[PDB]
Amino acid sequence: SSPPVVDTVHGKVLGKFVSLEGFAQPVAIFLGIPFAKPPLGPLRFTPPQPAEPWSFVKNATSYPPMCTQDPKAGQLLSELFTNRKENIPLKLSEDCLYLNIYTPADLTKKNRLPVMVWIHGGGLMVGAASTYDGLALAAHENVVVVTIQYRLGIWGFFSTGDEHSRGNWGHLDQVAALRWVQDNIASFGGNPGSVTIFGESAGGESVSVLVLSPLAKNLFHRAISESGVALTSVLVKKGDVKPLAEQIAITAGCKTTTSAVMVHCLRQKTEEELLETTLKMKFLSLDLQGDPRESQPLLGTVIDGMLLLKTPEELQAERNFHTVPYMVGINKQEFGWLIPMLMSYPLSEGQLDQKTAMSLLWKSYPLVCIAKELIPEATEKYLGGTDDTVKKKDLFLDLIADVMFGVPSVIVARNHRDAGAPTYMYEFQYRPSFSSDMKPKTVIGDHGDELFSVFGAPFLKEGASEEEIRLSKMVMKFWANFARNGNPNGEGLPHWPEYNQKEGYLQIGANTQAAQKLKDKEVAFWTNLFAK
Amino acid sequence: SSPPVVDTVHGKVLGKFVSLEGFAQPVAIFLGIPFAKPPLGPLRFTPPQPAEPWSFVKNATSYPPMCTQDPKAGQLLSELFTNRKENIPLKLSEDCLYLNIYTPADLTKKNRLPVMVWIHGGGLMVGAASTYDGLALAAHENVVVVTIQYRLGIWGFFSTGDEHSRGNWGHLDQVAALRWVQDNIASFGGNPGSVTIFGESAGGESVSVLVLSPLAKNLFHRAISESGVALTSVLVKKGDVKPLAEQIAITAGCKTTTSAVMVHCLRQKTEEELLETTLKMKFLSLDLQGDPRESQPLLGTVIDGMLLLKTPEELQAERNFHTVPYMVGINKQEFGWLIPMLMSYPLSEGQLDQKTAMSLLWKSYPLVCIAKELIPEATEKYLGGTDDTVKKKDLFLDLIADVMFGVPSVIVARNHRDAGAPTYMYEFQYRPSFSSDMKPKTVIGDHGDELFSVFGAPFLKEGASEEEIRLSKMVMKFWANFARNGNPNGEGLPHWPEYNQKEGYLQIGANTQAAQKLKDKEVAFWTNLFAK
Amino acid sequence: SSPPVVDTVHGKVLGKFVSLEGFAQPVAIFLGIPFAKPPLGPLRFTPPQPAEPWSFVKNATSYPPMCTQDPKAGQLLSELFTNRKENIPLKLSEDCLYLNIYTPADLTKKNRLPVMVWIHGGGLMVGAASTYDGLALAAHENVVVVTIQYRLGIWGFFSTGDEHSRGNWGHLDQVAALRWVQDNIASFGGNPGSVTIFGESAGGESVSVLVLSPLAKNLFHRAISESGVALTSVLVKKGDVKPLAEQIAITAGCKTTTSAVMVHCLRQKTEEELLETTLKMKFLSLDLQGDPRESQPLLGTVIDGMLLLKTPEELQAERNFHTVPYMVGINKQEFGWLIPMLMSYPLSEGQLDQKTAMSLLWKSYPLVCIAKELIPEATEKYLGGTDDTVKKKDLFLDLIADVMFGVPSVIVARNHRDAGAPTYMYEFQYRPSFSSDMKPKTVIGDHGDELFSVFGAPFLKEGASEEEIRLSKMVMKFWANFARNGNPNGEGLPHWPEYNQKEGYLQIGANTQAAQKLKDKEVAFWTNLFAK
């Protein structure tokens, strides 16, 4: 046939057709469609602006650049999370506000399939949209998959705390992409009236935030947060961000006379100079020596007064805002391997004792934000269970996993439920055959493990057992059904109870069945510990 | 008595009076009147913007800078084309969007004399308005002469092929100048309702382009193309210009990640850095060794979708656009000396044989764009006439001259005629006494040789014979009469037949008389050869 | 005891409360309130633009930076003029368009106290608003004191003489600050309908200029010029400023091809680079060897055609403009110590003779602008009084003092009077106890000596005798009374005659009483000498 040419508001776009095994209707794929003017030069540290219209047919046939980030870590995360067989090597650029579209619709006719916009994770410091291939999900559940990109690290989250650089540029880009979907997705067989946003980790936190933001209202109709919500501390900076701004400014060789001066100076720096500063800051690794209360993990979401008017805690306390069906989930062992490995945790012994745990739990401050006075009690509650040093290690990993995702996620769901909107929860417990070889075979339900089911990895990568394939089909079905009706259930699928007062949730894995009061016991413990 | 002070829309302008031998009314001359905002910094590679208004009286008494170009070549061409006795040495600057005005009208009264706007040539790489002195033409034919400048080379034609740098900046400056004339020329005794545009070589091509462009519609009412039209290949880049953009970016020490990145990087380079890149690219000289299909002659006109919606060929096939009297001409020997000399052609032997000719005709690809398979037939059709090696040389020079100007010019004229608009053609055959000493005395009607007649060189430079003086008078008469009524004819002048179906044209020279079917035989030949 | 929080157009501002000895109602102080967008990058050498609005509560609790200037000289002048006990060390920055507000009004209620906007002096090269503490004045006279800042030196007065950089940026900032007062002062208990502008030295000349400018019309209703008016040559550049522009450009390592090129180049320079250029230019010190007619004192006010349509002289000759009560004053010995000391005058001998005088009066050209032919007559008229070499020194100082302030001030006052507007004059003769120790005890009424009475230094610094304290009270009374009714008089205060035809003025000092025809004899002499 002839390559797919869709006419968007800004101009014509030329994609390519790809057929999936066992599907007649080939899927139309468009790579690198600009949804905003390149945030270069003076546009750096300012809201994303509308893209300039193009005169003829634009070739959306090449993978776009991933936003500037640590090239090593960024690639590593892409190999570890990609659902396609061969990991696609990417390029770094400040010019990265693009989005990829995977539409199973027959463009030759009018279609309004539900739209699923994916927001990649990566601690808001690394990541890319190209990592995720939407071919399987689009074809299998007949939905339009849209993977978007947003400014990362300094470029997307630098904030002086005042009007000279409010911050949250990255989030504003996500909002900008959603508006683009509203104004263009129809030309791709998508229904702008049924847009579902879903992300994992930092992406889940992003979805969480968009759900609380007034700007994002009416740009989506369903939300899914996989392993990450707006109560995941490490990602949301509360307090005076001015010190961090000055520390970054100095590290980049910038004066700190005034806020206006810092932003101006940083806007003069080259993309490369800022990247070097990023590497000097050492943002994804854990700091061993020094003072834990000073170690800055990353540049996250802030309370800018535009995107967020107050803290996520304060915002979710009110119900005076528009609500939509929300699905919040976590994996069995969120801190099982992936994260600890990437941050270079001192767990090389395979075992830990009471004292060393308290020592680590303290240095883990930037991740769990647990006072040093609470350390004793917390460690006792989890590791005091047994004397087995190896069990204390795994229990220590549960400690962290719960503080970062378990409890935060459940509190978020509860508040969403009490606000009166349809809520759903799940706990993914499965070990994908696509796990890294360096990942211990005992770790099941590690961070990002559900990504292989959601994105139909079993149908793009080889070796998936009939069990894994079946699992992926189920998950995609649930996800797509949710995208369709704001309810995961559907014929031929295990019943998924709504997260109401009974607090029922679905345990997804080799044996998928409903259960109740997820992490109920832990949320209780931590709500008191943190209440000092 | 008192220097001329005209009030334009942007502010007052002060010029100077200059009397020509035999004319009572002194001519008011204004040099360097800004018609746009300096395209400095971020304005680089962007459409020309309105000039900022000034507060008092601006001195238009000094020659403006000529746009950044090869200083050596630019000066050389200026010396070779100037119609004034002493060649005026110019300065290079990115700040060059100015125009010069020569008005014979008595500013103390209301006058509405026909306006002639001159577009200098120079392969769109070099050239300047100051080269041309309009004093003689203005006084002699009582018309307002306006010599404009536009961005050359990289500065005025850099194109990434997309919306991040469409290209054709230079042309847009020309259109910007014409708009300036419309809103201001009346303050100088000019009739904005009778504006004629005329240019030579690259300027002849510009006039041809402007005639095809929707943007320049209604900014002129007659056009004259001397030795150059929109079908003169070398100047009109067809196909993917992306590679040339990247090759330039790299030579300037820039990344090529994306089009937006290239334009950003090139916008950071200093004028000097870009001038060095220009010189490294070696754009005016012919490449001897390597592959001819790769040798990029220059950065010409492109199909941006703004100035030109499709190719010149495609555009002239339609008659759904506004038309005006058009005069198209060529010189007897376009590739006689000047051009080959500036491009450093291997013709130092004064003689050529069948084999060497095919060899040269091939390396001349970027000029004639003749397939290597056609070379044999072409060389045979021209040099196969005799065995005289010296005659083969000259016949080779006609070969080129016809492909670049002869045939293109005649096709354009025919299309214009068939489109239903008043068309006129001419063939200038004369050897000005102002020719370079290094120019063989046998070459008559070389490139740019009519410039001395058109601009009345015989009345500014010395030694003109009464025959040459008389010829210049006649040419200026024809040109101004055309500028006046869209018809060259007038009492006291040889009848100039309209280029209608009989294809009558005027042969201007020592003996000026009508003729018919100019280059009719060659157009036929080349139309088939190129039809492969 | 809750810090004061005022809501301005652009956002909420948080200040601090400060109680003065003997005043119940504490004064609300706000430091560093932005009244314009930081003039960084491309905004350099362009008019001030509106400040971007802020999202929450901005802390106006830290002193803003002083505009880039000679750090050493700037600090010295701040120490010498400050009315607070401890001089506040400041920081340099291009980001300096801020203002400080001292309001005695009880914000919890609606107040419309008269507003006094202070413009600091410093030859338009140095100075800061923080130097002046409005606490005493605000409290003692119950008026809102506003100290503003404006661009200095190159940043605020660079002019190419054309539209590419008209100049007078600093003055435009002053007008920008006044508009801010109009749109916000009400929120601080101020009355936008009763705004009085007053400054000293360069600030006095600024007030004078604003009184002549059409742009500042309706932004103030009363004006006070202390030791400086628009006829103080040294600050107002008349003639072709192009040469100075080129000299600065070159000194900063910039081409001078064209005006647009110079401005572009200088815009690229870093604050530090321009600061270095400033120091190289050596603008506040006197040039000993070379040609006096070339020594450029500073970058002053120019006739841009925006702020000033013609020269101050020419402007005050007309009465077709809006007028307000104007108070013009001078000190007994304007060139007594401070100025000569800062400019490094060769007066280290304490005595001078007729010949050396003429020698100095010549090199003092950039200050007094006296022709070398007039030097003889002028020196004779002043120093010819006695043979005492020490008396000649002091008489020489009066010579200068009268040419720069005495005569200028009186001419301005007379014109203002004749123009039909309420005029007042005064001559301050008092030696503050806060004078520098290096200042001879014989100098009384030195430049800036009234600053300590006007700003109530006696109530912030220690050691003020009951005589000095009383003087300050009186002065502030006169000043505030003027700010209130456009007339200094009031009960319990010596009668201050209006400067009408009798030319009565007030001599302020240990003995304050009216007098007549101030400098009437000198104005006479100089009006002829300068009439050549």
Ligand SMILES: CC(=O)N[C@H]1[C@H]([C@H](O)[C@H](O)CO)O[C@@](O)(C(=O)O)C[C@@H]1O
């Ligand atoms: C160096 C030069 O040629 N520039 C000159 C410009 C011209 O107006 C423009 O360049 C276009 O001529 O302004 C002047 O002529 C002028 O107003 O007195 C002086 C200046 O030197």
Ligand SMILES: CC(=O)N[C@H]1[C@H]([C@H](O)[C@H](O)CO)O[C@@](O)(C(=O)O)C[C@@H]1O
């Ligand atoms: C603009 C740019 O330089 N990027 C690349 C694009 C990508 O698709 C972009 O992400 C979106 O066009 O692909 C091209 O081949 C294209 O023809 O558009 C050009 C280039 O290599």
Ligand SMILES: CC(=O)N[C@H]1[C@H]([C@H](O)[C@H](O)CO)O[C@@](O)(C(=O)O)C[C@@H]1O
């Ligand atoms: C880093 C610094 O010293 N700047 C200070 C600025 C000032 O407003 C400006 O410098 C003008 O005074 O912002 C603050 O006042 C503020 O809003 O909290 C505090 C901050 O410390």
Ligand SMILES: *[C@@H]1O[C@H](CO)[C@@H](O)[C@H](O)[C@H]1NC(C)=O
């Ligand atoms: C876009 O794709 C078409 C064919 O699908 C091709 O002709 C064109 O060159 C491509 N554009 C580029 C150069 O990326």
Ligand SMILES: *[C@@H]1O[C@H](CO)[C@@H](O)[C@H](O)[C@H]1NC(C)=O
């Ligand atoms: C140009 O203008 C200057 C001042 O702007 C003026 O003195 C003179 O009339 C002119 N000088 C020349 C001929 O450039």
Ligand SMILES: *[C@@H]1O[C@H](CO)[C@@H](O)[C@H](O)[C@H]1NC(C)=O
């Ligand atoms: C402003 O003052 C408040 C107290 O009034 C304080 O909390 C804050 O830290 C200060 N500055 C900032 C960073 O907002």
